[PDB]
């Protein structure tokens, strides 16, 4: 299906080039794996050009509302 089958972003945990993740509170379709992990959590990576690894599409975290 076109739903998020991948977890939220885990740097270092495990990946293949096809490894998808999610970031910016939106989904990341990662097509390169080594370059995907370069995307640090402070990095404003567009994915498309700067990373050349992910496509930022839309949110799929399911849980509603946020708090800190």
From TrEMBL:
S-S pairs: 4-60, 30-36
Lineage top rank: taxon: Bacteria
Annotated Chitin-binding type-3 domain residues: 6-53
The name this protein goes by in its record: Carbohydrate binding protein, putative, cpb33A
Protein species of origin: Cellvibrio japonicus (strain Ueda107)
Gene that produces this protein: cbp33A
């Amino acid at each position: 299906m076109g739903n998020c089958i991948s977890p939220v972003y885990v740097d270092g945990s495990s990946y293949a080039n096809n490894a998808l993740v999610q970031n910016n509170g939106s989904e990341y379709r990662c097509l390169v794996g080594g370059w995907c992990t370069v995307g640090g959590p402070y990095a404003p990576g567009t994915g498309w050009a700067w990373a050349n690894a992910w496509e930022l599409v839309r949110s799929c975290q399911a849980h509603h509302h946020h708090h800190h």
